[PDB]
Amino acid sequence: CPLSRDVSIHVLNTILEALQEVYDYLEDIRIKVETNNPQYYLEKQIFAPVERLLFNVVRLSEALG
């Protein structure tokens, strides 16, 4: 999905300090989603896809939900 595709694209770009940049990116996205600028889109549309792309799942889920 667009947002999900945008997240996937940026994440890949950085991966291909990098993993820290990734977590720092996701936190910011998380804030942007919750404030509607959420549970489902952060879990099924942002979390799961990244969990497959990429490392510590704990860091990610904490940077999300």
**Angle ∠(33,2,59) on CA atoms, nearest 5:** 50
How far apart CA 21 and CA 54 sit, in angstroms, is: 13
Q: Euclidean distance between the first and final Cα of the chain, in Å?
A: 19
Resolution (A): 4.6
Torsions phi, psi for 56 (to 5 deg): -135, 115
CB atoms inside a 10 Å sphere around CB 46 = 26
